Amino acid sequence: SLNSTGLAQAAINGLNARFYESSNARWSSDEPWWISGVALTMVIEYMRRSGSKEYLDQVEDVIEVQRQPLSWWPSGEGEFRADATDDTGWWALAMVRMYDLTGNEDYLNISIKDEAYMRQWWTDTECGGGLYVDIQDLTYKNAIANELYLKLVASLANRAPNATIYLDRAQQAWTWFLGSGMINGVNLINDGLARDSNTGSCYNNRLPVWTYNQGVILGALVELYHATKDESYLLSAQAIADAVLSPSNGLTSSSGVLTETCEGSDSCNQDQQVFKGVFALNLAELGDAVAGASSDPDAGQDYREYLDTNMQSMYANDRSEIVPTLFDSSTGDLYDVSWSGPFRNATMPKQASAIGLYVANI
Ligand code: NA
């Protein structure tokens, strides 16, 4: 009795009615730029899974304007090449999705430029591999920038005409990620790596376990499986997803709802507000690959049931409708950060995460 497609469209319409800036071809200029890339990913993936083309013109407008040389990083020369490798990775993966939706080689070319850009800050001389997130400072090799890069090369290994070195780079990047220690003893991924002051060796910095660091890695392993047909990549991804679903690890509540570690203290900032939807979209990618890899009709119900359970909870406890007026007839739905808690306000990162959950159920 729940239409995930219609609810995703209502959430996207609510995102546009409250946060889209037509004069800037961007959502919420007061919010981080990379979250506009996540929002573009959610709108693109909605069209891919639902077969709709309703926001195609808007998405093209955002791409055309935001691919220009960024005013805060002109040396990147545009094409989403920014002052941080994870900022670039979010838009790069959005262009991979835009290529999947349209088949236009232009978007694939952007992702190829982004891969070569991010690779510039991969070094073997610290932590035996991995890339830095802070382009200007080069002091932090974290989980999200390396998960985004890994999913990028793995995606290009399935789509780019020169798929050989992208597969070799993806296999080498996953080998480094697995051996880095960021995947801890319960198969969850901490924020990044610290460096020994004397030996130069790198180790898990034990910073918080964020949901989107348990998600992007799943899509990377799904793409690695599609490029190799090796179910070992799916089994590693399933181990990470199963750790998130286990309530003993604190990411899944007693009611079975995905819960960011900052929701209890009500301290989720603009970045953390978008994390949950990114995991949900990537979990749906894993559930699809798992169901298609085995003849069992029971392949991956837990992931589908999890996404469905979280969807109903967000529908009932986290929803709020915009008030239509005599002048503005825009209709849709707004959402807060907690998928079980009350609706206090709606922000663009909160809304983008919302769309990701509905799209993950399409
Ligand atoms: Na190490």
Numbering used by the authors: 78 to 439
Per the authors:
We characterized CtGH76 from the sordariomycete Chaetomium thermophilum, a member of the Fungi/Bacteria-mixed GH76 subfamily, revealing conserved structural features and functional divergence within the GH76 family. Here, we present the crystal structure of a novel fungal GH76 member from the F/B-mixed subfamily, in complexes with different glycans and glycan fragments.
CtGH76 crystals belong to space group P3121 with unit-cell parameters of a = 106.8, b = 106.8, c = 126.9 Å, α = β= 90°, and γ = 120° and one molecule per asymmetric symmetry unit. Accordingly, CtGH76 shares the same DD-motif, D163/D164 (black dashed box), in its active site as BcGH76 from Bacillus circulans TN-31 (D124/D125) and CtDfg5 (D134/D135). For Bt3792, the GH76 enzyme from Bacteroides thetaiotaomicron VPI-5482T, these two neighboring aspartate residues were shown to participate in substrate hydrolysis via a retention mechanism. Furthermore, the active site and the canyon-like glycan binding site of CtGH76 is lined with seven aromatic amino acids (W110, W111, W149, Y217, W287, Y289, F352) that potentially interact with the substrate, within an otherwise mostly negatively charged canyon. C204 anchors the loop connecting helices α5 and α6 via its disulfide bridge to β-sheet β1, whereas the second disulfide bridge, C339–C345, is situated within the loop connecting helices α9 and α10. CtGH76 features two wing-like β-hairpins protruding between helices α7 and α8 (β1/2, D268-R283, designated as WR1) and between helices α11 and α12 (β3/4, R396-D413, WR2). Otherwise, the CtGH76 resembles other structurally known members of the GH76 family.
